[PDB]
Design a protein around this ligand. Structure first.
Ligand SMILES: *[C@@H]1O[C@H](CO)[C@@H](O[C@@H]2O[C@H](CO)[C@@H](O[C@@H]3O[C@H](CO[C@H]4O[C@H](CO)[C@@H](O)[C@H](O)[C@@H]4O)[C@@H](O)[C@H](O[C@H]4O[C@H](CO)[C@@H](O)[C@H](O)[C@@H]4O)[C@@H]3O)[C@H](O)[C@H]2NC(C)=O)[C@H](O)[C@H]1NC(C)=O
Ligand SMILES: *[C@@H]1O[C@H](CO)[C@@H](O[C@@H]2O[C@H](CO)[C@@H](O[C@@H]3O[C@H](CO[C@H]4O[C@H](CO)[C@@H](O)[C@H](O)[C@@H]4O)[C@@H](O)[C@H](O[C@H]4O[C@H](CO)[C@@H](O)[C@H](O)[C@@H]4O)[C@@H]3O)[C@H](O)[C@H]2NC(C)=O)[C@H](O)[C@H]1NC(C)=O
Ligand SMILES: *[C@@H]1O[C@H](CO)[C@@H](O[C@@H]2O[C@H](CO)[C@@H](O[C@@H]3O[C@H](CO[C@H]4O[C@H](CO)[C@@H](O)[C@H](O)[C@@H]4O)[C@@H](O)[C@H](O)[C@@H]3O)[C@H](O)[C@H]2NC(C)=O)[C@H](O)[C@H]1NC(C)=O
Ligand SMILES: *[C@@H]1O[C@H](CO)[C@@H](O[C@@H]2O[C@H](CO)[C@@H](O)[C@H](O)[C@H]2NC(C)=O)[C@H](O)[C@H]1NC(C)=O
Ligand SMILES: *[C@@H]1O[C@H](CO)[C@@H](O[C@@H]2O[C@H](CO)[C@@H](O)[C@H](O)[C@H]2NC(C)=O)[C@H](O)[C@H]1NC(C)=O
Ligand SMILES: *[C@@H]1O[C@H](CO)[C@@H](O[C@@H]2O[C@H](CO)[C@@H](O)[C@H](O)[C@H]2NC(C)=O)[C@H](O)[C@H]1NC(C)=O
Ligand SMILES: *[C@@H]1O[C@H](CO)[C@@H](O[C@@H]2O[C@H](CO)[C@@H](O)[C@H](O)[C@H]2NC(C)=O)[C@H](O)[C@H]1NC(C)=O
Ligand SMILES: *[C@@H]1O[C@H](CO[C@@H]2O[C@@H](C)[C@@H](O)[C@@H](O)[C@@H]2O)[C@@H](O)[C@H](O)[C@H]1NC(C)=O
Ligand SMILES: *[C@@H]1O[C@H](CO)[C@@H](O)[C@H](O)[C@H]1NC(C)=O
Ligand SMILES: *[C@@H]1O[C@H](CO)[C@@H](O)[C@H](O)[C@H]1NC(C)=O
Ligand SMILES: *[C@@H]1O[C@H](CO)[C@@H](O)[C@H](O)[C@H]1NC(C)=O
Ligand SMILES: *[C@@H]1O[C@H](CO)[C@@H](O)[C@H](O)[C@H]1NC(C)=O
Ligand SMILES: *[C@@H]1O[C@H](CO)[C@@H](O)[C@H](O)[C@H]1NC(C)=O
Ligand SMILES: *[C@@H]1O[C@H](CO)[C@@H](O)[C@H](O)[C@H]1NC(C)=O
Ligand SMILES: *[C@@H]1O[C@H](CO)[C@@H](O)[C@H](O)[C@H]1NC(C)=O
Ligand SMILES: *[C@@H]1O[C@H](CO)[C@@H](O)[C@H](O)[C@H]1NC(C)=O
Lengths: 1038, 50
C-alpha cells in the first residue's frame, strides 16, 4: 500500500469565539500534525482500462476526521455520519457542492456501501440518461435542513463532535499548485452546528462497485493558535507533538527563542504494584477444622474466635467444597482484601430447608429460638452437605434445637440453659401435657433423606464491625519480586513508589515498618521473609527541553533531570543517540568529549547547544558545563599584568524602579455593582480595607522613591538647547528639541517596546510623573549629571565643567584626569559608538532589555492572573459571581456565594501577597536605584563593580515604562603587560611606594603606575615615597 | 464575517457586535476609577476640593 502523510492541515476554529492579534494554547479536539494518513484510490474506471481493486476510503471517526481530497468533478455525495450505521442510529446525510447543502439524518441499511455506476456518455451534473441511484433507506428523518483543471480549488472538511452537537467545517480554498501537499495553513470555519445527540464513530464516502487524497484522525491534543493583525488563523503548533510543540505551548510564541523550559515531569508509571503479606495463613482455623468428629447443635453453635491471623477464602472456593459461597451485606468477592473487627469460627449442622432460615430477614423456629443474626446484616453462609462424610446407619439426631422461649435470641446468643419454661398458667409440677411440654426436640434425620434433610458441614464466619481492632485480614498475592525497576509495592498499609532493592541494615523482631531521618518511608520488611529492603520514588526529576530558537529548525530534544535511563522511545541528523550523564537520561544530544562555553545549563553541569561540527553538521551537542575553557595565566610571586589599553563600554543593566501602580476597588473588584456581594464583602470589612491600605502604601512608597531617585532636587532643570561639546555629545539620549516630547531616540526604542502590554478593577493609578513629566525629571537628572554633576546632592544645581566632571568621575575609581585629558575625543567617539551598538541591540536583540522587559512581563502577567482567577471559579460557571447569585435562590445563593467569596478572598490575599513581595524586592531595587543615582550618578562611588558589570565611570538615567535605564559606563582593562613586579623596591635598602603604586618595570627601566591602567613612571621620591623596612619583605628586589 | 464575539490581549472584552446589524464597536469602561479629596487642613477652612 501507500501511506503518505497529511500536511499541517486538519484544524478548525476552536469554538464560537473571536479574539484578534492574540495567541492562545487553547485546549480542544485536533488532528495531530504530520501523522501518517492514507492515499485512497477509489476513482472510476475508464472506457478501455484504468482498473484496480478500488476499495473504499474508510477510517472510523476516531475523535474526529480531516478530509483533504482535491477532486475535479466531485461526484462523491454521501457523508454518512452514523454512530454505528446498523439500522439503529440516525445517520446524518451531507452532500456538498459550491457552498449549499441538503440535510437529512435517515438510517442506513444499504448493500455493500451505497454505490453507483460510472460509464461512458454521461457524468457531469445531469444525465439525459438517468442512472445514478440515490435512495437506499427510509426509516426516520428526525432532523433535516435546506440551504484547465489543474487544481482549481480544494474541498476540505474537518469533522468533530462535542456533547453530541456536531459542527460542519467547510472552506473551499483555491489551491492552483499541482506540485504536492501545500506547505501552508488555513483553518476551517463552521457553517451549521446542530445537536444530533448521538456519537459519531464512522464516516464513509460514496463510491461504485460491482491524484492526491488525504484522510486522517483526531486526538485530544492542544494547539498554539496564532491570529494575524487582520485576525484569522495563519499558523498553529501542537503541545504534545514534539518537544518544540510544548516549548511553544509553554512560551505561547510562534517565534520561541533558545533556552531550557520546564514542560512537565515524566511520571514514570510503576510497572506493577507489589502486593505482599506474611508467609502463610499463619494458623487460620480453616485447614484443620472441617475434618472433625461431630459438630454441635444450632442452639449450641460453637464459638472459636478468629484473630491475629489471615485467612485465604478463595482457595476454599476453588476447592469446590461449598454448597454456598455467597455473602449477604458483604460480597464473597472483595471479602479477601477487606477485613472486619472480630471473626469467629462456628461449626454446626443445619437443615437444607433451614439453610433459608439462616439468612438475613428470614424467619423460622431456628431463627426464633436457636440462632438469630442481628439486623446489622453483615454475614455469610459457608457449608456443604454431609451424606458422605457424616453419614451413619440408622441416622443421627444428636443435633437438636431449642423450641420454647418467649422472644428471640439476643445478638450472638448461644443458649444451653434449661431454665424452667412455662408458657401456660398452672405450675406443671409433674403434671405435663396441654400447656406443659418439654422445650427440647431433635432433628431425626437419616442418610436416606433428601439432601436438604441430609446432614450438612457448616462453618459460618461472623464479620462484626465493632470498635475493637480488626485482626483477621486478607490472603496472599505475593511473588511480585522486583529488583532495581520502578514499581509500586504494598506491604499492607505502608507503600512507596519505585524500587525494592536489598539494603545494608539489620532488623529486629518486634519491628515491622521502617522510617528515615525526614520521617518518610525508607525501608520495609517483608512479612513473608527477612530481607533488608529499600524504597526510592521512581524517577521524578523533571523535563526541561533544550532547543535553539524556533527561527532555527525543529530539531527537537528532551532532557530527564538527574534520572537513570529507564524510558527510551528514541525513534542522519538524529539516530540512536541516548547519552546519560550527571544531568540524567539526556536524549537528542550527542555527547561531546570537549566542552565549549556554556549557554543554557540543563542540570548538574551539562549544556546542550546547537553548534556546527565538521566530519565529512547541524545538531544538538551537550557537554559538561564550563566557562569559555580553562585559563592558565601563571601567577608567580613577582609577576603582574597591567593594561596599556581599555574600553569605555556602556553596559545596560537596568533596574525596575516602579510597578503598574494598580489599586483595587476591593468591593467593586470582587463585586462589580452587585448588591449582596458588596454587602458581604463590606461585612467582612477589615480584609479588603487593609488590602486597600497596603496597595495605597505601595503606590505612595514607590512614587516617593520615584521622586527621590529623580526629583532628588525638586527644582527642575532643563537642558540648554545649545548642544555643543565637540564630540562628547549625547544626541540619542539628551532631549531632542525637534521631538514632540523632549525625549530622545532611546526613549522611542523603549516605548515602542511596550509590545508586552482597565475593565476588571485593574484601576491603573496614573504615575505621579507620566511620560512627558517623568521625562522632564530624567532629562533634569541627565542635565545635572552632565552640568552640575555630583554637587546636585543638596538642592543646588551647582554647575561644573563637564570635561572635568567625568574627570572627577574617573577619579571615582582612582583614575587621574590624565587618561581623560589625553583621550577624551576618542573616549567620546567610542562612547557614541557604544550608544549606537546599544540602540542596534535593543532594536535587534530583545534580550538586551531582558530583565526589565521580563519584570514588566510578569507585572502584566500578574494583572492577567488577577483577572483570570475569576475563571478559576471553584464550583461556579461565570466570571463575575453576581449571575451565579442570581442563578440560585437568595438563601441558597447566599450559601453558594459564601464559599465563592471565601475563594475570592483567597484570590485577593494571594494576589496581594505576590504584589507585596514584588513590592519588597522592587523596593530594595528602588533603594538600589537611589544609590545608583546618588553614589553612582550624583557622584561616583569608590564602591567597585555594582554600577553594571565591571567598573563604573558614569551612569545615565532615562525613562522606561515603570522602569528606568542606567547607562552603566564601566571601565574595563584591555591589554596585558605581564612583566615582573614586587611589593616595593629596596633601592635605599628599604621599601618604597606612593600613596599607592605597583612597581612594574620593563627590564629596561623600573616603572611605577596605577592599578587599572598602564601609565608608568620611574621611581621618584616626589610621588613614590619611602616607608617600611627591607628586613623580612617577601618577593622584593634588592 | 466569522466573528460573533470579541476579546483582547489581556482577555478582556474588546468589541461586541450588534447581532441584528453589523457595525464596529468598542467597550471602554466609564469612570476609570478615582475618588479622592484634596482638602487642606481642617484646622484651616472648610473650602473643599475634589
Ligand atoms: C514459608 O513457609 C514454607 C513452609 O514450607 C517454607 O517452605 C520451605 O522453606 C525452606 C526454607 O525457607 C525450604 O528450604 C529450601 O532449601 C533449598 C536448598 O536446597 C538444599 O537443601 C535442601 C534441604 O532439604 C535439600 O533437600 C536440597 O537437596 C539442597 O541440598 C533452597 O534452595 C530453597 O530456597 C527457595 O526458597 C526460599 C524461601 O524459603 C526462596 O527465597 C529461594 O529463592 C528459593 O526459592 C529453600 O530455602 C523448603 O524446601 C521449603 N519447603 C516447602 C515445602 O515449602 C518457605 O520457605 C517459607 N517462606 C520463606 C520466604 O522462607
Ligand atoms: C585601544 O583600543 C582602541 C580600540 O579597541 C583603539 O582604537 C583604535 O585607534 C587606532 C589609532 O590609530 C585606530 O587606528 C586607525 O589608524 C588609521 C591609520 O591611518 C594612517 O595610516 C594610513 C596608512 O595606513 C594613512 O593613509 C592615513 O592617512 C593615516 O596616516 C587612522 O587613519 C585612523 O584614524 C581614523 O580617523 C581618521 C580621521 O580622518 C579617518 O580618516 C580614518 O579613516 C580612521 O577612521 C585610526 O587612527 C583604530 O581604527 C581604532 N580602533 C577602531 C576599532 O576603530 C585605541 O587606539 C587603542 N589604544 C592604544 C594606545 O593602542
Ligand atoms: C483584511 O483582509 C481584507 C481582504 O484580504 C483586506 O482588504 C483589502 O483591501 C484592499 C484595498 O481597497 C483591496 O485592494 C485591491 O482591490 C483591487 C480591486 O481593484 C478595483 O477596485 C478598486 C476599488 O477597490 C478600484 O480602485 C480599482 O480601480 C479597481 O476598480 C484589486 O484589483 C487589487 O488586486 C487589490 O485586491 C484588497 O483586495 C483587499 N485585500 C485583498 C487583496 O484581499 C483588508 O485590508 C485586510 N485588513 C488588513 C490588511 O489588516
Ligand atoms: C448543490 O446541491 C444542492 C442540494 O443538493 C442543490 O440545491 C438544490 O438543487 C436542486 C436540484 O438538484 C434544485 O431543484 C433546488 O432548487 C436546489 N435548492 C434547494 C433544494 O434549496 C444545488 O443546486 C447544487 N448545486 C450544484 C452547483 O451542484
Ligand atoms: C459533461 O460530459 C459530457 C460527456 O459525458 C459532455 O459532452 C461532451 O460535449 C462536447 C460538446 O461541447 C463534445 O465535444 C464531447 O464529445 C461530449 N463528450 C462525450 C460525448 O463524451 C458535456 O458537454 C459535459 N458538460 C459539462 C457541463 O461539463
Ligand atoms: C553629536 O555629534 C555628531 C558628530 O558631530 C552629530 O552627528 C550628526 O548626526 C546627524 C543625525 O541625523 C547626521 O545627519 C549628521 O550627518 C551627523 N554629523 C554632523 C552633523 O556633523 C550629532 O548630530 C551631534 N548631536 C548633537 C545633539 O549635537
Ligand atoms: C617565588 O617563586 C620563584 C619561582 O616561582 C621561586 O624561585 C625558585 O623557584 C623554584 C621552583 O619554584 C625553586 O626550585 C627555587 O629554589 C626557587 N629559588 C629561590 C631562590 O627561592 C622563589 O623561591 C619564590 N619565592 C620568592 C621569595 O621569590
Ligand atoms: C491651626 O494652625 C495654626 C498655624 O499652624 C500652621 O498651619 C498648620 C496647618 C501647620 O501647617 C503648622 O505647621 C503651621 O504652622 C495654629 O496657629 C493653630 O493653633 C492651629 N489650630 C489648631 C491646631 O486647632
Ligand atoms: C505510517 O507509516 C509508518 C511506516 O510504515 C508506520 O510505522 C505507521 O504506523 C503508519 N501510520 C499509521 C498506520 O497510522
Ligand atoms: C489494464 O490496467 C490494469 C491496471 O490494474 C493492468 O493490470 C492491465 O495490465 C491493463 N491491461 C493491459 C491489457 O495491459
Ligand atoms: C455516546 O454514547 C453514550 C452512551 O452511554 C452517551 O451517553 C453519550 O452522550 C454519547 N456521546 C455523544 C457525544 O453523543
Ligand atoms: C536565530 O536568531 C539568533 C539571534 O541572534 C541568530 O544568532 C541565529 O543565527 C538565528 N538563526 C536562524 C536559523 O534564524
Ligand atoms: C538509577 O539507576 C542507577 C543504576 O541503574 C542507580 O545507581 C541510581 O541510584 C538510580 N537512581 C536513583 C535516583 O536511585
Ligand atoms: C571522550 O570521547 C569519547 C568518544 O566519543 C566519549 O565516549 C567520552 O564520553 C568522552 N569523555 C568525556 C569525559 O566527555
Ligand atoms: C608573560 O607570560 C608568558 C607565559 O604565558 C611568559 O612566557 C612571558 O615571559 C611573560 N612575559 C614576561 C615579560 O615575562
Ligand atoms: C619596553 O621597552 C621598549 C624599548 O624602550 C619599548 O619599545 C616597549 O614599548 C616597552 N614596553 C613596555 C610594556 O613598557
Amino acid at each position: 500500500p501507500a501511506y503518505t502523510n497529511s500536511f499541517t492541515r486538519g484544524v478548525y476554529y476552536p469554538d464560537k469565539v473571536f479574539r484578534s492579534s492574540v495567541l492562545h494554547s487553547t485546549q480542544d479536539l485536533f488532528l495531530p500534525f504530520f501523522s501518517n494518513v492514507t492515499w485512497f484510490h477509489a476513482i472510476h474506471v475508464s472506457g478501455t482500462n484504468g482498473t484496480k481493486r478500488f476499495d473504499n476510503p474508510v477510517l472510523p471517526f476516531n475523535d474526529g476526521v480531516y478530509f483533504a481530497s482535491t477532486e475535479k468533478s466531485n461526484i462523491i455525495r454521501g457523508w454518512i455520519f452514523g454512530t454505528t450505521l446498523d439500522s439503529k442510529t440516525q445517520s446524518l446525510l451531507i452532500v456538498n457542492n459550491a457552498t449549499n447543502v441538503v440535510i437529512k439524518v435517515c438510517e442506513f441499511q444499504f448493500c455493500n456501501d451505497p454505490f453507483l455506476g460510472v460509464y461512458y456518455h454521461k457524468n457531469n451534473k445531469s444525465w439525459m440518461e438517468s442512472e445514478f441511484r440515490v435512495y437506499s433507506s427510509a426509516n426516520n428523518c428526525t432532523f433535516e435542513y435546506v440551504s484547465q483543471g489543474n487544481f482549481k480549488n480544494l474541498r476540505e472538511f474537518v469533522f468533530k463532535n462535542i456533547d453530541g452537537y456536531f459542527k460542519i467545517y467547510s472552506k473551499h480554498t483555491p489551491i492552483n499548485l499541482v506540485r504536492d501537499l501545500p506547505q501552508g495553513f488555513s483553518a476551517l470555519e463552521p457553517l451549521v452546528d446542530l445537536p444530533i445527540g448521538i456519537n459519531i464513530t464512522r464516516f464513509q464516502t460514496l463510491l461504485a462497485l460491482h491524484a492526491a487524497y488525504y484522510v486522517g484522525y483526531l486526538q485530544p491534543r492542544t494547539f498554539l493558535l496564532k491570529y494575524n493583525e487582520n485576525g484569522t488563523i495563519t499558523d498553529a503548533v501542537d503541545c504534545a507533538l514534539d518537544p518544540l510543540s510544548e516549548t511553544k505551548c509553554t512560551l505561547k510564541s510562534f517565534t520561541v527563542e533558545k533556552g531550557i523550559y520546564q514542560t512537565s515531569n515524566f511520571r514514570v508509571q510503576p510497572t506493577e504494584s507489589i502486593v505482599r503479606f506474611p508467609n502463610i495463613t499463619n494458623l487460620c482455623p480453616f485447614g484443620e477444622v472441617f475434618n472433625a468428629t461431630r459438630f454441635a447443635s444450632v442452639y449450641a453453635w460453637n464459638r472459636k474466635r478468629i484473630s491475629n491471623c489471615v485467612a485465604d477464602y478463595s482457595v476454599l472456593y476453588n476447592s469446590a467444597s461449598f454448597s454456598t459461597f455467597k455473602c449477604y451485606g458483604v460480597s464473597p468477592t472483595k471479602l479477601n482484601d477487606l477485613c472486619f473487627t472480630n471473626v469467629y469460627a462456628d461449626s454446626f449442622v443445619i437443615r437444607g430447608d433451614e439453610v433459608r432460615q439462616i439468612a438475613p430477614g428470614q424467619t423460622g423456629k431456628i431463627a426464633d429460638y436457636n440462632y438469630k443474626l442481628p439486623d446489622d446484616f453483615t454475614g455469610c453462609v459457608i457449608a456443604w452437605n454431609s451424606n458422605n462424610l457424616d453419614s451413619k446407619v440408622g441416622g443421627n439426631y444428636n443435633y437438636l434445637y431449642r423450641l420454647f422461649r418467649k422472644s428471640n435470641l439476643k445478638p450472638f446468643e448461644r443458649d444451653i440453659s434449661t431454665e424452667i419454661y412455662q408458657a401456660g398458667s398452672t405450675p406443671c409440677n409433674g403434671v405435663e401435657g396441654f400447656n406443659c411440654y418439654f422445650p427440647l426436640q431433635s432433628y431425626g434425620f437419616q442418610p436416606t433423606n433428601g439432601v436438604g434433610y441430609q446432614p450438612y458441614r457448616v462453618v459460618v464466619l461472623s464479620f462484626e464491625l465493632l470498635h475493637a481492632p480488626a485482626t483477621v485480614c486478607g490472603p496472599k498475592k505475593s511473588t511480585n519480586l522486583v529488583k532495581n525497576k520502578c514499581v509500586n509495592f504494598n506491604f499492607n498499609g505502608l507503600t512507596g513508589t519505585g524500587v525494592l532493592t536489598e539494603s545494608n541494615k539489620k532488623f529486629l523482631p518486634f519491628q515491622q515498618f521502617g522510617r528515615d531521618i525526614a520521617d518518610t518511608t525508607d525501608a520495609v520488611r517483608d512479612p513473608q521473609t527477612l530481607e533488608i529492603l529499600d524504597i526510592t520514588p521512581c524517577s521524578f526529576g523533571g523535563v526541561s527541553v533544550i532547543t535553539p530558537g524556533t527561527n532555527t529548525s525543529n530539531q527537537v530534544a528532551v532532557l530527564y533531570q538527574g534520572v537513570n535511563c529507564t524510558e527510551v522511545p528514541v525513534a542522519y541528523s538524529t539516530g540512536s543517540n541516548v547519552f546519560q550523564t550527571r544531568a540524567g537520561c539526556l536524549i537528542g544530544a550527542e555527547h561531546v568529549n570537549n566542552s565549549y562555553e556554556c549557554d543554557i545549563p540543563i542540570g548538574a553541569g551539562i549544556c546542550a547547544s546547537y553548534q556546527t561540527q565538521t566530519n565529512s553538521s547541524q545538531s544538538i551537542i551537550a557537554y559538561t558545563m564550563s566557562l569559555g575553557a580553562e585559563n592558565s595565566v601563571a601567577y608567580s610571586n613577582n609577576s603582574i599584568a597591567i593594561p596599556t589599553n581599555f574600553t569605555i563600554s556602556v553596559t545596560t543593566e537596568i533596574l525596575p524602579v516602579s510597578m503598574t501602580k494598580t489599586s483595587v476597588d476591593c468591593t467593586m473588584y470582587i463585586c462589580g455593582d452587585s448588591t449582596e456581594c458588596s454587602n458581604l464583602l463590606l461585612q467582612y470589612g477589615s480584609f479588603c480595607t487593609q488590602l486597600n491600605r497596603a496597595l495605597t502604601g505601595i503606590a505612595v512608597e514607590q512614587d516617593k522613591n520615584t521622586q527621590e531617585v529623580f526629583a532628588q532636587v525638586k527644582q527642575i532643570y532643563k537642558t540648554p538647547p545649545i548642544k555643543d561639546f565637540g564630540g562628547f555629545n549625547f544626541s540619542q539620549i539628551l532631549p531632542d528639541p525637534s521631538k514632540p516630547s523632549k525625549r530622545s531616540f532611546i526613549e522611542d526604542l523603549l516605548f515602542n517596546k511596550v509590545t508586552l502590554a482597565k475593565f476588571n478593577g485593574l484601576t491603573v493609578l496614573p504615575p505621579l510623573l507620566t511620560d512627558e513629566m517623568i521625562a522632564q525629571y530624567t532629562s533634569a537628572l541627565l542635565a545635572g549629571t552632565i552640568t552640575s554633576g555630583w554637587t546636585f546632592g543638596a538642592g543646588a544645581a551647582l554647575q561644573i565643567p563637564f570635561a572635568m566632571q567625568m574627570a572627577y568621575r574617573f577619579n571615582g575609581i582612582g583614575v587621574t584626569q590624565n587618561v581623560l585629558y589625553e583621550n577624551q575625543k576618542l573616549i567620546a567617539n567610542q562612547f557614541n559608538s557604544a550608544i549606537g551598538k546599544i540602540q542596534d541591540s535593543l532594536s535587534s536583540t530583545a534580550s538586551a532589555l531582558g530583565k526589565l522587559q521580563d519584570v514588566v512581563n510578569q507585572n502584566a502577567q500578574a494583572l492577567n492572573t488577577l483577572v483570570k482567577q475569576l475563571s478559576s471559579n471553584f464550583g461556579a460557571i461565570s466570571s463575575v459571581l453576581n449571575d451565579i447569585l442570581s442563578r440560585l435562590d437568595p438563601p441558597e445563593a447566599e450559601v453558594q456565594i459564601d464559599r465563592l467569596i471565601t475563594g475570592r478572598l483567597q484570590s485577593l490575599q494571594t494576589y496581594v501577597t505576590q504584589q507585596l513581595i514584588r513590592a519588597a524586592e522592587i523596593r530594595a531595587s528602588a533603594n538600589l536605584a537611589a544609590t545608583k543615582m546618588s553614589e553612582c550618578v550624583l557622584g561616583q562611588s569608590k564602591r567597585v563593580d555594582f554600577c553594571g558589570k565591571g567598573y563604573h565611570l558614569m551612569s545615565f538615567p532615562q525613562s522606561a515604562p515603570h522602569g528606568v535605564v542606567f547607562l552603566h559606563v564601566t571601565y574595563v582593562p584591555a591589554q596585558e603587560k605581564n612583566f615582573t613586579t614586587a611589593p616595593a623596591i629596596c633601592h635605599d635598602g628599604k621599601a618604597h611606594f606612593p600613596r599607592e603604586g605597583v612597581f612594574v618595570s620593563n627590564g629596561t627601566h623600573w616603572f611605577v603606575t596605577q592599578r587599572n591602567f598602564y601609565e608608568p613612571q620611574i621611581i621618584t621620591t616626589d610621588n613614590t615615597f619611602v616607608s617600611g623596612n627591607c628586613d623580612v619583605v617577601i618577593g622584593i628586589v634588592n
